[PDB]
mmCIF file with all atom_site columns, C-alpha atoms in Angstrom:
data_model
loop_
_atom_site.group_PDB
_atom_site.id
_atom_site.type_symbol
_atom_site.label_atom_id
_atom_site.label_alt_id
_atom_site.label_comp_id
_atom_site.label_asym_id
_atom_site.label_entity_id
_atom_site.label_seq_id
_atom_site.pdbx_PDB_ins_code
_atom_site.Cartn_x
_atom_site.Cartn_y
_atom_site.Cartn_z
_atom_site.occupancy
_atom_site.B_iso_or_equiv
_atom_site.pdbx_formal_charge
_atom_site.auth_seq_id
_atom_site.auth_comp_id
_atom_site.auth_asym_id
_atom_site.auth_atom_id
_atom_site.pdbx_PDB_model_num
ATOM 1   C CA . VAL A 1 1   ? 39.186 114.362 228.990 1.00 0.00 ? 2   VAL A CA 1
ATOM 2   C CA . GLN A 1 2   ? 37.593 116.397 232.038 1.00 0.00 ? 3   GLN A CA 1
ATOM 3   C CA . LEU A 1 3   ? 33.985 115.591 232.814 1.00 0.00 ? 4   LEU A CA 1
ATOM 4   C CA . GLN A 1 4   ? 31.424 117.369 235.043 1.00 0.00 ? 5   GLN A CA 1
ATOM 5   C CA . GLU A 1 5   ? 27.778 115.978 236.150 1.00 0.00 ? 6   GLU A CA 1
ATOM 6   C CA . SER A 1 6   ? 24.690 118.332 237.062 1.00 0.00 ? 7   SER A CA 1
ATOM 7   C CA . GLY A 1 7   ? 21.046 117.573 237.203 1.00 0.00 ? 8   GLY A CA 1
ATOM 8   C CA . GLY A 1 8   ? 20.862 115.970 240.545 1.00 0.00 ? 9   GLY A CA 1
ATOM 9   C CA . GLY A 1 9   ? 18.414 116.607 242.591 1.00 0.00 ? 10  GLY A CA 1
ATOM 10  C CA . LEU A 1 10  ? 15.664 115.656 245.775 1.00 0.00 ? 11  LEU A CA 1
ATOM 11  C CA . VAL A 1 11  ? 12.385 114.320 244.789 1.00 0.00 ? 12  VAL A CA 1
ATOM 12  C CA . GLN A 1 12  ? 9.651  112.157 245.775 1.00 0.00 ? 13  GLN A CA 1
ATOM 13  C CA . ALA A 1 13  ? 9.008  108.324 244.680 1.00 0.00 ? 14  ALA A CA 1
ATOM 14  C CA . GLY A 1 14  ? 7.611  108.269 241.280 1.00 0.00 ? 15  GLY A CA 1
ATOM 15  C CA . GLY A 1 15  ? 9.368  111.623 240.290 1.00 0.00 ? 16  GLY A CA 1
ATOM 16  C CA . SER A 1 16  ? 11.729 112.358 237.321 1.00 0.00 ? 17  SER A CA 1
ATOM 17  C CA . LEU A 1 17  ? 15.341 113.489 236.992 1.00 0.00 ? 18  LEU A CA 1
ATOM 18  C CA . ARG A 1 18  ? 17.787 114.074 234.221 1.00 0.00 ? 19  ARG A CA 1
ATOM 19  C CA . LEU A 1 19  ? 21.362 113.950 234.794 1.00 0.00 ? 20  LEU A CA 1
ATOM 20  C CA . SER A 1 20  ? 23.785 115.693 232.620 1.00 0.00 ? 21  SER A CA 1
ATOM 21  C CA . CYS A 1 21  ? 27.684 115.124 232.072 1.00 0.00 ? 22  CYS A CA 1
ATOM 22  C CA . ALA A 1 22  ? 29.613 117.725 230.169 1.00 0.00 ? 23  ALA A CA 1
ATOM 23  C CA . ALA A 1 23  ? 32.755 116.425 228.655 1.00 0.00 ? 24  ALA A CA 1
ATOM 24  C CA . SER A 1 24  ? 35.746 119.131 228.316 1.00 0.00 ? 25  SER A CA 1
ATOM 25  C CA . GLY A 1 25  ? 39.336 119.056 227.341 1.00 0.00 ? 26  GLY A CA 1
ATOM 26  C CA . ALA A 1 26  ? 40.244 116.851 224.541 1.00 0.00 ? 27  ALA A CA 1
ATOM 27  C CA . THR A 1 27  ? 36.875 116.691 223.480 1.00 0.00 ? 28  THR A CA 1
ATOM 28  C CA . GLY A 1 28  ? 38.016 116.309 219.587 1.00 0.00 ? 29  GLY A CA 1
ATOM 29  C CA . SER A 1 29  ? 38.489 112.440 220.141 1.00 0.00 ? 30  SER A CA 1
ATOM 30  C CA . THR A 1 30  ? 35.879 109.985 220.738 1.00 0.00 ? 31  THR A CA 1
ATOM 31  C CA . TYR A 1 31  ? 35.031 107.785 223.894 1.00 0.00 ? 32  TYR A CA 1
ATOM 32  C CA . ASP A 1 32  ? 32.267 105.889 225.264 1.00 0.00 ? 33  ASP A CA 1
ATOM 33  C CA . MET A 1 33  ? 30.681 107.144 228.431 1.00 0.00 ? 34  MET A CA 1
ATOM 34  C CA . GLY A 1 34  ? 28.946 105.533 231.248 1.00 0.00 ? 35  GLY A CA 1
ATOM 35  C CA . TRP A 1 35  ? 26.722 106.286 234.248 1.00 0.00 ? 36  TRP A CA 1
ATOM 36  C CA . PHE A 1 36  ? 27.493 104.892 237.952 1.00 0.00 ? 37  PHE A CA 1
ATOM 37  C CA . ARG A 1 37  ? 26.123 104.965 241.131 1.00 0.00 ? 38  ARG A CA 1
ATOM 38  C CA . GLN A 1 38  ? 27.035 104.813 244.636 1.00 0.00 ? 39  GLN A CA 1
ATOM 39  C CA . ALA A 1 39  ? 25.008 104.506 247.642 1.00 0.00 ? 40  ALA A CA 1
ATOM 40  C CA . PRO A 1 40  ? 27.130 105.194 251.363 1.00 0.00 ? 41  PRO A CA 1
ATOM 41  C CA . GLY A 1 41  ? 28.595 101.975 252.322 1.00 0.00 ? 42  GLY A CA 1
ATOM 42  C CA . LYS A 1 42  ? 28.389 100.102 249.210 1.00 0.00 ? 43  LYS A CA 1
ATOM 43  C CA . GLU A 1 43  ? 30.307 99.157  246.181 1.00 0.00 ? 44  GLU A CA 1
ATOM 44  C CA . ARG A 1 44  ? 29.964 101.125 243.042 1.00 0.00 ? 45  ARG A CA 1
ATOM 45  C CA . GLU A 1 45  ? 27.889 99.826  240.255 1.00 0.00 ? 46  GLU A CA 1
ATOM 46  C CA . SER A 1 46  ? 27.108 100.575 236.607 1.00 0.00 ? 47  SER A CA 1
ATOM 47  C CA . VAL A 1 47  ? 23.705 101.988 235.589 1.00 0.00 ? 48  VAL A CA 1
ATOM 48  C CA . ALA A 1 48  ? 24.269 102.533 232.175 1.00 0.00 ? 49  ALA A CA 1
ATOM 49  C CA . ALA A 1 49  ? 26.306 102.855 229.087 1.00 0.00 ? 50  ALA A CA 1
ATOM 50  C CA . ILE A 1 50  ? 26.506 104.345 225.513 1.00 0.00 ? 51  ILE A CA 1
ATOM 51  C CA . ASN A 1 51  ? 28.909 103.960 222.354 1.00 0.00 ? 52  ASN A CA 1
ATOM 52  C CA . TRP A 1 52  ? 29.667 107.322 221.199 1.00 0.00 ? 53  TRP A CA 1
ATOM 53  C CA . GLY A 1 53  ? 29.458 106.579 217.391 1.00 0.00 ? 54  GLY A CA 1
ATOM 54  C CA . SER A 1 54  ? 26.522 104.467 217.231 1.00 0.00 ? 55  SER A CA 1
ATOM 55  C CA . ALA A 1 55  ? 24.669 105.555 220.337 1.00 0.00 ? 56  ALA A CA 1
ATOM 56  C CA . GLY A 1 56  ? 24.355 102.190 221.021 1.00 0.00 ? 57  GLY A CA 1
ATOM 57  C CA . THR A 1 57  ? 22.857 101.449 224.555 1.00 0.00 ? 58  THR A CA 1
ATOM 58  C CA . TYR A 1 58  ? 23.459 99.595  227.679 1.00 0.00 ? 59  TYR A CA 1
ATOM 59  C CA . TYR A 1 59  ? 21.479 99.299  230.814 1.00 0.00 ? 60  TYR A CA 1
ATOM 60  C CA . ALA A 1 60  ? 21.685 97.291  233.904 1.00 0.00 ? 61  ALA A CA 1
ATOM 61  C CA . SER A 1 61  ? 18.533 95.490  235.107 1.00 0.00 ? 62  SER A CA 1
ATOM 62  C CA . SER A 1 62  ? 17.622 97.593  238.034 1.00 0.00 ? 63  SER A CA 1
ATOM 63  C CA . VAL A 1 63  ? 16.928 100.359 235.574 1.00 0.00 ? 64  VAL A CA 1
ATOM 64  C CA . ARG A 1 64  ? 15.597 98.924  232.651 1.00 0.00 ? 65  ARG A CA 1
ATOM 65  C CA . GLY A 1 65  ? 12.557 100.233 231.168 1.00 0.00 ? 66  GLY A CA 1
ATOM 66  C CA . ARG A 1 66  ? 12.909 103.340 233.743 1.00 0.00 ? 67  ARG A CA 1
ATOM 67  C CA . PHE A 1 67  ? 15.944 104.882 232.743 1.00 0.00 ? 68  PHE A CA 1
ATOM 68  C CA . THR A 1 68  ? 17.292 106.246 229.457 1.00 0.00 ? 69  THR A CA 1
ATOM 69  C CA . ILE A 1 69  ? 20.978 106.914 228.425 1.00 0.00 ? 70  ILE A CA 1
ATOM 70  C CA . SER A 1 70  ? 21.429 109.382 225.543 1.00 0.00 ? 71  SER A CA 1
ATOM 71  C CA . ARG A 1 71  ? 24.149 111.427 223.900 1.00 0.00 ? 72  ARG A CA 1
ATOM 72  C CA . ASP A 1 72  ? 24.597 114.826 221.872 1.00 0.00 ? 73  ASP A CA 1
ATOM 73  C CA . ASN A 1 73  ? 27.542 115.178 219.965 1.00 0.00 ? 74  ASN A CA 1
ATOM 74  C CA . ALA A 1 74  ? 27.342 118.560 219.373 1.00 0.00 ? 75  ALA A CA 1
ATOM 75  C CA . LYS A 1 75  ? 27.054 119.275 223.166 1.00 0.00 ? 76  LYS A CA 1
ATOM 76  C CA . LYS A 1 76  ? 29.598 116.933 224.122 1.00 0.00 ? 77  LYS A CA 1
ATOM 77  C CA . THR A 1 77  ? 27.281 115.661 227.037 1.00 0.00 ? 78  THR A CA 1
ATOM 78  C CA . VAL A 1 78  ? 25.643 112.678 227.777 1.00 0.00 ? 79  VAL A CA 1
ATOM 79  C CA . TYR A 1 79  ? 22.366 112.428 229.808 1.00 0.00 ? 80  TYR A CA 1
ATOM 80  C CA . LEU A 1 80  ? 20.549 110.073 232.065 1.00 0.00 ? 81  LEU A CA 1
ATOM 81  C CA . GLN A 1 81  ? 16.754 110.512 232.157 1.00 0.00 ? 82  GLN A CA 1
ATOM 82  C CA . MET A 1 82  ? 15.260 108.873 235.320 1.00 0.00 ? 83  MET A CA 1
ATOM 83  C CA . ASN A 1 83  ? 11.720 108.030 235.597 1.00 0.00 ? 84  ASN A CA 1
ATOM 84  C CA . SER A 1 84  ? 9.477  106.239 238.369 1.00 0.00 ? 85  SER A CA 1
ATOM 85  C CA . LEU A 1 85  ? 12.483 107.035 240.900 1.00 0.00 ? 86  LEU A CA 1
ATOM 86  C CA . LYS A 1 86  ? 12.408 104.631 243.506 1.00 0.00 ? 87  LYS A CA 1
ATOM 87  C CA . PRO A 1 87  ? 13.960 105.422 247.243 1.00 0.00 ? 88  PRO A CA 1
ATOM 88  C CA . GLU A 1 88  ? 16.453 102.934 246.621 1.00 0.00 ? 89  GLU A CA 1
ATOM 89  C CA . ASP A 1 89  ? 18.069 104.613 243.558 1.00 0.00 ? 90  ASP A CA 1
ATOM 90  C CA . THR A 1 90  ? 19.375 107.315 246.051 1.00 0.00 ? 91  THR A CA 1
ATOM 91  C CA . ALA A 1 91  ? 23.133 107.492 245.371 1.00 0.00 ? 92  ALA A CA 1
ATOM 92  C CA . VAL A 1 92  ? 26.107 109.696 244.061 1.00 0.00 ? 93  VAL A CA 1
ATOM 93  C CA . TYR A 1 93  ? 25.684 109.022 240.288 1.00 0.00 ? 94  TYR A CA 1
ATOM 94  C CA . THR A 1 94  ? 28.914 109.440 238.414 1.00 0.00 ? 95  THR A CA 1
ATOM 95  C CA . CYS A 1 95  ? 29.797 109.774 234.816 1.00 0.00 ? 96  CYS A CA 1
ATOM 96  C CA . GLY A 1 96  ? 32.767 107.977 233.271 1.00 0.00 ? 97  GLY A CA 1
ATOM 97  C CA . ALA A 1 97  ? 34.588 107.969 230.074 1.00 0.00 ? 98  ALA A CA 1
ATOM 98  C CA . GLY A 1 98  ? 36.731 105.422 228.398 1.00 0.00 ? 99  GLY A CA 1
ATOM 99  C CA . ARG A 1 99  ? 36.529 102.499 225.636 1.00 0.00 ? 100 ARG A CA 1
ATOM 100 C CA . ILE A 1 100 ? 33.959 99.354  225.999 1.00 0.00 ? 101 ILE A CA 1
ATOM 101 C CA . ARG A 1 101 ? 32.886 96.001  235.752 1.00 0.00 ? 110 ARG A CA 1
ATOM 102 C CA . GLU A 1 102 ? 34.021 99.729  235.981 1.00 0.00 ? 111 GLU A CA 1
ATOM 103 C CA . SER A 1 103 ? 37.626 99.056  234.543 1.00 0.00 ? 112 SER A CA 1
ATOM 104 C CA . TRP A 1 104 ? 37.117 100.135 231.086 1.00 0.00 ? 113 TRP A CA 1
ATOM 105 C CA . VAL A 1 105 ? 36.478 103.516 232.707 1.00 0.00 ? 114 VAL A CA 1
ATOM 106 C CA . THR A 1 106 ? 39.451 106.012 231.869 1.00 0.00 ? 115 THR A CA 1
ATOM 107 C CA . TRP A 1 107 ? 38.439 109.460 233.520 1.00 0.00 ? 116 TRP A CA 1
ATOM 108 C CA . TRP A 1 108 ? 35.937 110.002 235.907 1.00 0.00 ? 117 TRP A CA 1
ATOM 109 C CA . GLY A 1 109 ? 33.679 112.716 237.121 1.00 0.00 ? 118 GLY A CA 1
ATOM 110 C CA . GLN A 1 110 ? 32.986 114.401 240.278 1.00 0.00 ? 119 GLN A CA 1
ATOM 111 C CA . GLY A 1 111 ? 29.475 112.809 241.327 1.00 0.00 ? 120 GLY A CA 1
ATOM 112 C CA . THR A 1 112 ? 26.058 114.309 241.539 1.00 0.00 ? 121 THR A CA 1
ATOM 113 C CA . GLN A 1 113 ? 23.773 113.539 244.243 1.00 0.00 ? 122 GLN A CA 1
ATOM 114 C CA . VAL A 1 114 ? 20.159 112.210 243.657 1.00 0.00 ? 123 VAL A CA 1
ATOM 115 C CA . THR A 1 115 ? 17.705 111.814 246.639 1.00 0.00 ? 124 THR A CA 1
ATOM 116 C CA . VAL A 1 116 ? 14.478 110.001 246.322 1.00 0.00 ? 125 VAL A CA 1
ATOM 117 C CA . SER A 1 117 ? 12.580 110.451 249.644 1.00 0.00 ? 126 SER A CA 1
ATOM 118 C CA . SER A 1 118 ? 9.844  107.823 250.332 1.00 0.00 ? 127 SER A CA 1
#
């Protein structure tokens, strides 16, 4: 299982982005996917996760009501829609897959930068 993120960018506070994470390799099998983020000098934290079969969602408190995680089985891609971005949302966002802390993750992507200026 190989993961590649895209959709990062640089926007002002109040703006929106949508991150993508495409899975490749053994994409026949089903795995849950999550988004994580890490600001320079800080420990990485969970943002959101999704069950592949049910599309059941999980959200960190910091992003509730602002970010939406979703998945498309045909495209084997998970998405993070981000609205009402805040400067403190600035970080590298990484995708991970495994079966539902980040210890449940078995395969990690590369990371994509999100910057939100004041």
